[PDB]
Ligand binder design. Structure first.
Ligand SMILES: [Cl-]
Length: 130
């Protein structure tokens, strides 16, 4: 319905705002762009499903996220990809993993504070009806 299309449009507006707040955080700059195949040639072979905040913005606009769960799955993928690809004890690896975890925790925290549980429940019920 028109009511349902407005629900999903509100979700997209909410998701864009949260995503922008993450993308402008200096700690999360590494997660704002795809990994460069020139700089990191073995990335696309080690990491089967690359994800970054620019790709998240594209997916919002392509209507790929019908619930906050769908969105958080991709946030979680940014984080898990960073932990997998940079698992070592060295300072460069430990810094990216600390940043990955903060990106994840930050997103979860914004959603917990600012996304109404009944709004999310509605999204889930419309989605399940499709
Ligand atoms: Cl840096």
């Amino acid at each position: 319905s028109m009511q349902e299309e407005d629900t999903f449009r509100e979700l997209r507006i909410f998701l864009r705002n949260v995503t922008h707040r993450l993308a402008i955080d200096k700690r999360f700059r590494v997660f704002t762009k795809p990994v460069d195949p020139d700089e990191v040639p073995d990335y696309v072979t080690v990491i089967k499903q690359p994800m970054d905040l620019s790709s998240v913005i594209s997916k919002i606009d392509l209507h790929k996220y019908l619930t906050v769960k769908d969105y958080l799955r991709d946030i979680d993928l940014i984080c898990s990809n960073a932990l997998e690809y940079n698992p070592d004890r060295d300072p460069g690896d430990r810094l990216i993993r600390h940043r990955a975890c903060a990106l994840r925790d930050t997103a979860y925290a914004i959603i917990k504070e600012e996304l109404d549980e009944d709004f999310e429940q509605l999204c889930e019920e419309i989605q399940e009806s499709r």
